[PDB]
Amino acid sequence: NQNAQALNTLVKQLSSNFGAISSVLNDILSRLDPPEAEVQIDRLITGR
Amino acid sequence: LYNSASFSTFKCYGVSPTKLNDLCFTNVYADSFVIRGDEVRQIAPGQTG
Amino acid sequence: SFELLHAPATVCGPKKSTNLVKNKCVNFNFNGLTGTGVLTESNKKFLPF
Amino acid sequence: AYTNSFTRGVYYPDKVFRSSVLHSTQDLFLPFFSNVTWFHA
Numbered sequence: 286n287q288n289a290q291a292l293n294t295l296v297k298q299l300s301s302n303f304g305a306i307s308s309v310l311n312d313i314l315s316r317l318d319p320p321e322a323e324v325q326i327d328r329l330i331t332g333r
Numbered sequence: 334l335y336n337s338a339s340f341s342t343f344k345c346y347g348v349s350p351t352k353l354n355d356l357c358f359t360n361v362y363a364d365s366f367v368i369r370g371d372e373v374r375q376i377a378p379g380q381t382g
Numbered sequence: 383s384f385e386l387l388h389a390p391a392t393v394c395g396p397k398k399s400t401n402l403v404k405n406k407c408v409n410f411n412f413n414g415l416t417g418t419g420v421l422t423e424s425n426k427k428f429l430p431f
Numbered sequence: 432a433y434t435n436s437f438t439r440g441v442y443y444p445d446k447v448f449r450s451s452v453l454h455s456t457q458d459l460f461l462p463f464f465s466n467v468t469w470f471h472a
């Protein structure tokens with residue numbers, strides 16, 4: 286049960302933004318220029 | 334619109350203008366008005382004038 | 383002004399669609415919804431909205 | 432004129448289809464066992 290709970294928390298953490306506009310970085314990359322996309326991507330990477 | 338080469342300012346905020354043709358949106362608004370030249374910069378978020 | 387909300391997209395980026403291939407590892411973007419995977423006919427039911 | 436609303440008045444807060452989950456969402460709903468009117472006509 287402990288292993289399952291930890292793994293479920295880890296997988297749920299992929300649904301957060303950590304301050305970026307969107308949780309999924311596919312959308313970030315699909316509607317932003319790389320110089321401006323990298324700003325969001327940095328926050329998302331730190332959060333993960 | 335991007336390649337019209339006749340628009341003084343075209344800056345986008347949420348998106349990238351070059352990638353804009355590839356997106357897909359729920360709905361879009363369109364406002365139109367006439368202003369002078371020295372307050373176009375006032376049309377921006379977090380701006381006072 | 384654009385927006386990203388839960389209702390299905392109405393005004394969308396104009397570019398030619400294609401066919402769809404199943405049971406293959408392909409890249410796709412369903413009217414904005416972009417991803418990569420194996421497209422397979424499903425057995426679940428969707429409320430028609 | 433004043434009847435009690437039982438466990439009733441809940442809608443689908445979104446469209447993302449889900450099955451066999453226990454999804455939680457904060458939105459506007461009828462509180463369970465609320466004091467509702469009985470306008471008679």
Ligand SMILES: *[C@@H]1O[C@H](CO)[C@@H](O)[C@H](O)[C@H]1NC(C)=O
Binds near residue numbers: 433435466
């Ligand atoms: C609903 O409101 C009325 C207002 O007078 C009150 O008399 C009644 O007791 C309330 N219902 C319940 C279940 O308390």
